[PDB]
Structure formats: C-alpha cells, structure tokens
C-alpha cells in the first residue's frame, strides 16, 4: 500500500522502458528529483521536468532512446528494500556491470555515483543500481 515511492518510481521507469512511451508522470519528492537529476547526469534519460500542483507533484520524465533501436538500459534494480536494511563501506562498494554501470548511493553529502563516491571516499545507503 504505497510502501515505498522510490521503488515505485523504479518500476515506473522499468515498465516505461517495456512500453516504450515517450514520457511518464511521477509524484514529487526531493529524494526522487535528486536521483532523477543523477540519471540526468548519467544521460540514460533525455529530460526531466516538474509541474507544480497542490500539493505534491507532478514530475514528468522523458525516456531517452537509442539511434539504432535498443533499450538504453538493459537492467535496473533496487537492492535496498524495507524489512532488509543494507549498508556499504566506502571501499566495499561493488562496481556493477564493471565500467559501464554506476551505483546510486545516498550519502551524508547526498546521493552520489560510485565514481564520485569513490572520489569523496564517502559511504552511505545504496539506493539502487542502474545499467
């Protein structure tokens, strides 16, 4: 029953990849907009734009698509989940899908990519992996 908005947004983007619609809407949160900005930096998605309406919402996300068909992301998963806490020391963080994939790791400094996290040497909760 709406147990976690972020995992919900992840099944939103994965189903969106499955249905190949140009865009979809999600309810607002700064936690959501920040990591969405991280995906905006990674470039897997073309654009994200919020549209205010009382109270929360509503962000509209535009999926990017390749020049030669093919899904831009071959996989996406949220290792973190309620009822099973997870933690990661700064040196312990995996480099998923080797050099292509990037971690989405919330830290005390904020959400960070695994490269930026390795540079900052800052540990934190691992929100999700995208590849």
């Amino acid at each position: 029953v709406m147990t976690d908005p972020i995992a919900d947004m992840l099944t939103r983007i994965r189903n969106a990849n499955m249905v190949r619609h140009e865009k979809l809407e999600i309810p607002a949160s700064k936690l959501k907009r920040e990591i969405a900005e991280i995906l905006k930096r990674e470039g897997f998605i073309r654009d994200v734009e919020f549209v205010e309406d009382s109270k929360q919402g509503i962000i509209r996300v535009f999926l990017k698509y390749g020049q030669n068909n093919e899904r831009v992301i071959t996989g996406l998963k949220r290792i973190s989940k309620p009822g099973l806490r997870v933690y990661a020391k700064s040196n312990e963080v995996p480099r998923v899908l080797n050099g292509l994939g990037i971690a989405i790791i919330s830290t005390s400094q904020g959400v960070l990519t695994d490269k930026e996290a390795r540079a900052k040497q800052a540990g934190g909760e691992v929100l999700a992996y995208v590849w």
Binding site: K64, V72, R95, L97, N98, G99, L100, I102, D114
Partner: protein
C-alpha cells in the same frame, strides 16, 4: 544485427550427438539427432541443431544450421566485457569476467562454444537443468545479450569509457 553473413570456413567442432527412437505401428523408427556449433575464434559464434536418420546427414544439417546464424560475441581485453545471468528452459547459467591467467572455466559443450569465441579466459557455472541443449541455447542467448561497454558509450553522449577497469 545488421544481417548475418557467413564467409569464413571453420573446423566446425561437434558438441553433442544422440540416437532417438519413435514408436510407430509395426515397430520403432530410429532417427539420430546431433548438435554442432561454429566459431571462427575471431569473436563470431553460431549454433546448429541437426537431426537426421544418417549421421553424416545429421552433422551436415547441423553445419548448415550453424551457418544460418552467428553471434557478435563482444570481447574486451581478450575476455567477455561483463558478467551475465541467463536462464532458459529452466536452465540458468552464470558467466563472469576473469583474470587473464585464470583460463577457461566452464562445462563441456559451453566450453566448446567459448573456445569457438576464441576467448582466453572465462568464469562460468551451470544452473537448473544439466541438459546440454538448453545450456548451449542459454549460453549463446547470453552471448547475444553481450555488448561492449564502449558500444553503449557510443550509444550516448557522456564520455568514452567512464569507470576504469
């Protein structure tokens, strides 16, 4: 893909062969079934399932069927670029990148198609059903799944080869 050209001869090493029987009124007709796979050891691999009453006919049908299809099989640093999981027919298989000295590590026929890949090293493990056919179809569906990280980097405008490795 695009397309599937077949312009290079191969030794065409065999992976499996087995007799098969079918009941018919007045007896039991026999037909053989043999799987054979092709690979140039230049990063191209294909598969061929050929059944026939006669063994040369079966292996040659497997040859033409192997000729019918090929896989791009990406290979960065003389090894598969990234780890993958591949279930098929309740036949999962895991593959991982390995150190150059590690050598090829797999089951039989999947080691055969990997030798056809020409790759000098690999981690691999069978899961679920042990039958060779689904192991080959899954391993090669996984090879088809494989793509260079540099290729995906070409697909989008970020930077060439982000993370080191």
């Amino acid at each position: 893909r695009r397309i599937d050209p077949s312009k290079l001869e191969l030794e065409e090493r065999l992976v499996t062969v087995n007799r098969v029987a079918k009941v018919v009124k007045g007896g039991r007709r026999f037909r053989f079934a043999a799987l054979v796979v092709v690979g140039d050891k230049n990063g191209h691999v294909g598969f061929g399932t050929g059944k026939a009453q006669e063994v040369p006919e079966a292996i040659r049908k497997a040859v033409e069927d192997a000729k019918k299809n090929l896989i791009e099989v990406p290979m960065v640093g003389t090894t598969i670029p990234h780890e993958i999981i591949g279930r098929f027919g309740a036949g999962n298989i895991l593959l991982k990148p390995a150190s150059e000295g590690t050598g090829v590590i797999a089951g039989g026929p999947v080691r055969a198609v990997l030798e056809l890949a020409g790759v000098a090293d690999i981690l691999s493990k069978s899961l679920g059903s042990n039958t060779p056919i689904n192991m080959i179809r899954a391993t090669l569906q996984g090879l088809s799944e494989l793509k260079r990280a540099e290729d995906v980097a070409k697909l989008r405008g970020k930077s060439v080869e982000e993370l080191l490795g």
